[PDB]
Design a protein around this ligand. Structure first.
Ligand code: 59A
Length: 251
């Protein structure tokens, strides 16, 4: 395995890999980490480009994935992709795809032109229909995964998985000092626990002698490093290597 790897550079024909979304005022990170990596993998293993609907995952999976805007289970999300499939759907107000995200973007622990994010947000309804004007039908727009698995808490195995199959979904414990991240390799030193947070791991590298994971957050582009961040790799820091999940799309 190489010393560094950036899925964005390795798969130039898959622009979703470079995208950063906004989960809005809803605890749907579990769904976002999933549909983002799934979008990347559909492109990587089908060379078609599809903006997988965070809305479809968030609203229609149900108990198998947890509790919607109240938090969920990453592995459960990939299971939904293999069982019921996922339709397309872009950003809020984009009118792209079958079911675009219905929760407005907001400012995540930063100042900006958007309204500040609020912790309170309700899970939208599971509507098995597409926006007006879009074709095909909801049922016909479903993209299925043909496998859903969990990668071991093993740095090398995680790197190998990304290297061969593309970005994966992961999760780590968020402490308040992470909220103000701007650059460099994040290492937890202070702050109260904020809870678990699912994200998308798309690579790795070494900065100033510190090994790290290249991660895409779902708090828009004005948070962190253009929406991305780097976190210590190899020590299961904040549990970053303890909940890796992925899967492969059907042919
Ligand atoms: C992940 C989530 O969306 N968390 C919030 C966010 O704004 O990103 C806060 C609470 C984290 C600082 O409740 C979601 C989940 O499914 O967590 C378990 C992985």
């Amino acid at each position: 395995l190489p010393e560094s790897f950036d899925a964005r550079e390795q798969w130039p024909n898959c622009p979703t890999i470079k995208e950063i979304r906004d989960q809005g005022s809803c605890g749907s990170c579990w769904a976002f980490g999933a549909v983002e990596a799934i979008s990347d993998r559909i492109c990587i293993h089908s060379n078609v480009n599809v903006e997988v609907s965070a809305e479809d995952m968030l609203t229609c999976c149900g108990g198998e994935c947890g509790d919607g805007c109240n938090g969920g289970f990453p592995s459960g999300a990939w299971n939904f992709w293999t069982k019921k499939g996922l339709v397309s759907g872009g950003l809020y107000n984009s009118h792209v795809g079958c079911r675009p995200y219905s929760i407005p973007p907001c400012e995540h622990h930063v100042n900006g032109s958007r309204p500040p994010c609020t912790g309170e947000g309700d899970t939208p309804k599971c509507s098995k229909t597409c926006e007006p004007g879009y074709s095909p039908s909801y049922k016909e727009d479903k993209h299925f995964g043909c496998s859903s698995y969990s990668v071991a808490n093993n740095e090398k195995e995680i790197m190998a998985e990304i290297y061969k199959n593309g970005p994966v979904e992961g999760a780590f414990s968020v402490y308040s000092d992470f909220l103000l991240y701007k650059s460099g390799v994040y290492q937890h030193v202070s702050g109260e626990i904020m809870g678990g947070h699912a994200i998308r791991i798309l690579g790795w590298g070494v900065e100033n002698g510190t090994p790290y994971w290249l991660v895409g957050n779902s708090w828009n582009t004005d948070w962190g490093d253009n929406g991305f961040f780097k976190i210590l790799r190899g020590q299961d820091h904040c549990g970053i290597e303890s909940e890796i999940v992925a899967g492969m799309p059907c042919t």
